[PDB]
């Protein structure tokens, strides 16, 4: 309601706990379909055509809800009641369970919820159209959103939470376009998920066939250093949105075959004359469904946390995930042998459960896993950070006279930045002179031709370190 | 439900007697003790039962009551005691022992706990040592017999 008297008002509202963070380096962009998308006095979805496409900067889930709504109803929830009875029909025990047969492909809200739960910061939201009960996802809308995100400079990470419902050819096309503009802008990195067989229950060794299918996608060979891929999907603790009269009820007795009842949940609600005991049982059953999400928004949140705690030059691996129950598939060492190292170089990182520890990210290698320079994620992320900060620092010198004094100024700026970075422990070496070098000069880096036409050329070299992955042990007996 | 326990140093004694209940100096004491009761029993062993024996109640015993003050040179109470002791003429009395607190609803001094002590009569009287080399107060101590005590519920 609306408050008018200057006193304390008390309300009972059921919801989850809020969570916010301060993040400087990991600014992702999420592209997908939304519910509302209304800002100020402009409705972006007012027309069925001529949609307004523009990113909006969000700092919390409350701000997301303020502009974009929450979610839509599922329409595919079923609940089965099991009755154990006597030889005369007398009831001895009654239980209930819930299941979902085909979830909706529109899931930005749950993804944002998981993102903020795992330590995410400010993000950009780009809507490509309204959510609808037909579940249609089009390549053109997503490519238009990707084309629009090219105009915001702070964006560092690209995420498409709905990509798994897209066919293989369209998936390859979308990812190829994303990698191409990452290569053109030189300051972005792409996070991917693996497509799994849409079967329930998922058969044994599905991960091998899924990996083989991924290896055959046509992707540009020289841009594969600009992305990474993670697997598999994750079961989390959040609830579904549903409409009470859309839930279907089944019954089974003494282990026999299931039979569809003539009522929905609306027929058990005591407000309509139903049986409230079974109604309470059904509601408790529905609340227990786990929710299944792709891993990428949790990976982005964990990137933000790792940069805040260790540093960007560290590997974002060996870290636990929050608000997670379980991976959907179990991956062993003999299977990861062909996921981490492969003749094609298309490495896939794994999410694995370890006893007493929980669910950890295992593997920190890019899609260019055979490249002697760009194997590891942390090296490229560090290079991107350093290059963008040098760019920002150098921008104030544009339109200056092209003379020795400006060369001296820009050289001093770059050396000061790299010295501050060496001091933090990001560069190797005992002294600054062993970590980096910066050079500019006539007939050293520039020919006069570049000078006269308005160009400056600076040569920069930097030394970094790389992680160790395998630890080995030798056990023996000692002479007494 | 209680969170803090009571304090022991705020207390009073009243003599419900000849006319001593209105005499101010007869209520001021430095120390009061001796308020405890004990049950005395005997032990019986039953043949064949080797796991325990039987404890049977016998009688009840009470401790003497002890009072300590600085010496009062003219006291009606001490006249009562010395009449009992020198002329073998005893006349038992009733007593009240009170534990006090502050109540407010401003504030007031009120009783918190009260015990009735029934049929008290003199048992012992003493005065402390005189010593030329110590800083001390002349302290007198009185001990009384009684039948029993009860809570004024």
């Amino acid at each position: 309601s609306t408050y008018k008297t200057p006193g304390v008002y008390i309300e009972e509202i059921s919801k989850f706990p809020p969570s916010i963070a301060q993040v400087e380096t990991a600014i992702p962009a999420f592209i997908g379909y939304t519910q509302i998308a209304k800002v100020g006095v402009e409705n972006f979805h007012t027309d069925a055509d001529n949609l307004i496409l523009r990113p909006v900067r969000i700092t919390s889930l409350l701000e997301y809800e303020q502009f974009f709504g929450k979610a839509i109803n599922e329409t595919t929830i079923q609940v089965v009641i099991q009755d154990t009875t006597d030889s005369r029909g007398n009831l001895t025990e009654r239980k209930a369970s819930a299941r979902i047969t085909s979830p909706s492909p529109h899931n930005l809200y749950y993804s944002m919820q998981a993102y903020f739960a795992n330590g995410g910061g400010p993000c950009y939201i780009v809507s490509v159209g309204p959510m609808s009960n037909t579940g249609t996802i089009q390549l053109e809308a997503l490519q238009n959103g990707l084309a629009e995100v090219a105009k915001e400079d702070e964006v560092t990470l690209l995420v498409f939470p709905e990509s798994q419902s897209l066919s293989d050819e369209n998936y390859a096309a979308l990812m190829s376009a994303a990698l191409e503009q990452c290569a053109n802008l030189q300051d972005r990195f792409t996070v991917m998920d693996l497509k799994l067989p849409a079967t329930r229950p998922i058969p044994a060794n599905a991960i091998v066939g899924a990996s083989n299918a991924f290896r055959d996608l046509s992707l540009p060979q020289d841009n594969l250093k600009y992305g990474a891929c993670y697997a598999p999907d994750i079961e989390t603790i959040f609830n579904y949105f549903y409409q009470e009269d859309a839930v279907t009820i089944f019954r089974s007795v003494n282990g026999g075959a299931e039979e569809q009842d003539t009522l929905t949940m609306a027929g058990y609600n005591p407000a309509n004359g139903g049986d409230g005991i079974q109604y309470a049982l059904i509601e408790s059953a529905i609340d227990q469904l786990p929710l299944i999400l792709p891993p990428s928004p949790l990976v982005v949140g964990q990137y933000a946390r790792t940069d805040n705690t260790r540093g960007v030059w560290k590997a974002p691996a060996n870290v636990a995930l929050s608000s997670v129950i379980k991976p959907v598939l179990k991956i062993t060492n003999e299977q990861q042998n062909n996921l981490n190292v492969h003749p094609t170089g298309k490495s896939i990182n794994a999410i694995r459960a370890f006893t007493g520890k929980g669910t950890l990210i295992w593997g920190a290698r890019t899609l260019a896993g055979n490249d002697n320079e760009w194997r590891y994620v942390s090296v490229r992320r560090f290079f991107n950070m350093a290059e963008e900060s040098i760019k920002k620092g150098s921008e104030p010198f544009v339109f200056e006279p092209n003379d020795a004094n400006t060369w001296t100024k820009v050289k001093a700026m770059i050396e000061n930045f790299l010295t501050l970075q060496w001091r933090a422990g990001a560069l190797a070496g005992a002294k600054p002179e062993q970590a980096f070098y910066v050079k500019i000069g006539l007939n050293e880096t520039m020919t006069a031709l570049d000078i006269l036409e308005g160009r400056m050329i600076v040569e920069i070299g930097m030394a970094v370190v790389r992680p160790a992955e395998f630890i080995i042990l030798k056990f023996s007996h000692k002479m007494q | 439900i209680r969170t803090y326990p009571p304090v022991s140093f705020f207390f009073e004694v009243v003599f419900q007697g000849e006319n001593l209940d209105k005499d101010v100096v007869e209520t001021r004491f430095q120390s009061v003790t001796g308020l405890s009761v004990d049950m005395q029993t005997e032990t019986l062993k039953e043949g064949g039962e080797n796991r325990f024996e039987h404890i049977l109640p016998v009688r009840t015993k009470y401790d003497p009551l002890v009072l300590k003050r600085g010496l009062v040179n003219d006291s009606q109470m001490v006249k009562w005691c010395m009449d009992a002791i020198l002329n073998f003429d005893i006349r038992p009395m009733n007593l009240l022992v009170r534990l006090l607190h502050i109540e407010r609803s401003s504030s007031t001094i009120a009783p918190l706990m009260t015990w009735k002590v029934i049929n008290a009569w003199p048992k012992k009287w003493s005065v402390s040592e005189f010593n030329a080399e110590q800083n001390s107060i002349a302290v007198e101590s009185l001990e009384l017999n009684y039948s029993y005590f009860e809570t004024l519920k």
Binding site: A424 | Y4, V7, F10, H101, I102, S107
Partner: protein, 142 residues
């Protein structure tokens, strides 16, 4: 960042009219240690295990202004074993005048109040001080 914080900008909420003080101390948490050893241990030193907790008192100072007698009033609230108890909150601020580290003190009540000294040649102000007992304390950073 790479720079630490100073100790010259803070605030105390204690239920009075003024939030300014000159000195704040006594923020400390301690735990006891229990030692144990059995006879046949290949180790000759004792083993340690956690015990009970202990908190220290709080001491705060302030200059004396005209018309302000809050310390004595709070101290004089005492009755035989009862007294007004308060929640004490101490904070650390930054340059935008917002909090950064918070100490939360449950059920504080004063145990000592000390007035000033007077010297004729003294070119110094009049300083009063208080000492506070309290059950438990907490620390919130961030």
């Amino acid at each position: 960042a790479e720079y630490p914080l100073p100790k010259f900008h803070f605030q105390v909420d204690w239920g009075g009219s003024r939030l300014g003080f000159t000195e704040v101390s006594g923020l400390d948490v301690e735990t006891e240690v229990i030692e144990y050893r059995e006879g046949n241990l290949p180790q000759y030193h004792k083993l340690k295990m956690p015990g009970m907790q202990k908190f220290s008192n709080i001491t705060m100072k302030r200059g004396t202004f005209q018309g302000d007698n809050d310390f004595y009033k709070w101290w004089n609230t005492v009755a035989l074993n009862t007294i007004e108890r308060r929640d004490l909150t101490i904070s650390l601020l930054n340059e935008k005048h917002e909090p950064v580290v918070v100490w939360k003190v449950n059920r504080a009540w004063p145990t000592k109040v000390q007035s000033t000294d007077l010297k004729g040649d003294g070119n110094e102000v009049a300083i009063e001080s208080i000492e506070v007992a309290h059950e438990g304390l907490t620390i919130q950073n961030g």
